[PDB]
Design a protein around this ligand. Structure first.
Ligand SMILES: O=C(O)CNC(=O)C(=O)O
Ligand SMILES: [Mg+2]
Ligand code: NI
Ligand SMILES: [Zn+2]
Length: 331
């Protein structure tokens, strides 16, 4: 069995190996990459996402979110307070202001310590889930707006044509902006490209151990758990590496830098934080190996998680018994 310790693997494809996305994902899995839940892909030196980032300041962040924490330093929830619209240029200036800028630090480990010690005492502002792309249309390899769609994949594997579309999203981050512990909708893959700026630190639990994380989360968030059997789908719960280690949960950590891709694999729970002003682009995708995970994915039926249009068909076709209850939670 390849990668039996479930370590995060890092790949360096050549330009020839960068031509066929599906083939290279399947190659990574042949080496056991999926067992970690997360892999890093460093693109060939010949590749670029676009020519420059000099012309992005006029992108609008229609609904910036202030991430307000409740709890203790290693175990907290966050809610998202809506703020007034601002441009990427205005947000960048805000990120770099004294109130929000990254503090002086020695290295990534020192910044991680500072994050976990101090995150709860501040409320950083995040631009999330902005439909759009920063890939040049003439970038032909690993262009996140030109991947095969999940609806086409389900049709190819299972024979059923379904409605829906699959497009990328942009994320504008600052110091302390946080992504809570979650798997993807319908336990899909994700791919994330850090276009510019400061790093992103990731934490991940191997898919084969995901239920260990869920059990700890029910213990640490007992009211949330009573409310919803799939409350991690709400994307609000944080648990520090120190707390995970105290509870014997298997996990790994890695820092993504500008110009690097990350792939999350089906049922790989992940969380993390941004180091300073940055911009990432991400999209969900599927492969033949996803289908069996999609059929078994938990679902939030309490009202809180309330998802993409295009999730309807995946629940309807892969999870017909759950469909009626799930849909009641969407109305
Ligand atoms: O860029 C982000 O905010 C974090 N993205 C994800 O959780 C992802 O790509 O799966
Ligand atoms: Mg612009
Ligand atoms: Ni994710
Ligand atoms: Zn719920």
């Amino acid at each position: 069995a390849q990668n039996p310790n479930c370590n995060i693997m890092i790949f360096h494809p050549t330009k020839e190996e960068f031509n066929d996305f599906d083939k290279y994902i399947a190659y990574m899995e042949s080496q056991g990459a999926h067992r970690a839940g997360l892999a890093k892909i460093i693109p060939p030196k010949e590749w670029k996402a676009r020519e420059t980032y000099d012309n992005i300041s006029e992108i609008l962040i229609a609904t910036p979110l202030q991430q307000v924490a409740s709890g203790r330093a290693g175990v907290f929830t966050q809610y998202h307070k809506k703020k007034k619209a601002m441009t990427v240029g205005e947000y960048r200036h805000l990120a770099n202001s004294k109130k929000y800028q990254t503090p002086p630090h020695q290295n990534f480990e020192d910044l991680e310590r500072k994050y976990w010690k101090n995150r709860i005492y501040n409320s950083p502002i995040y631009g999330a889930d902005i439909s759009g792309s920063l890939f040049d249309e003439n970038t032909k390899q690993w262009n996140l707006g030109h991947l095969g769609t999940i609806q086409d994949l389900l049709e190819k594997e299972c024979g059923v044509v379904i409605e829906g579309v699959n497009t990328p999203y942009l994320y504008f981050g600052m110091w302390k902006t946080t992504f809570a512990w979650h798997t993807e909708d319908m336990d899909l893959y994700s791919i994330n490209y850090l276009h510019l700026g400061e790093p992103k630190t990731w934490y991940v639990v191997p898919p084969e151990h995901g239920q260990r994380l869920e059990r700890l989360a029910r213990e640490l968030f007992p009211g949330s758990s009573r409310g919803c059997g799939a409350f991690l789908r709400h994307k609000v719960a944080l648990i520090s590496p120190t707390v995970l280690k105290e509870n014997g949960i298997p996990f790994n950590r890695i820092t993504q830098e500008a110009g690097e891709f990350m792939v999350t694999f089906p049922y790989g729970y992940h969380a993390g934080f941004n180091h300073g002003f940055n911009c990432a682009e991400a999209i969900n995708f599927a492969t033949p190996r996803w289908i069996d995970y999609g059929k078994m994915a938990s679902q939030c039926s309490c009202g809180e998680a309330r998802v993409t249009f295009s999730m309807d068909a995946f629940v309807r076709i892969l999870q017909p018994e759950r469909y009626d209850l799930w849909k009641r939670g969407q109305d």
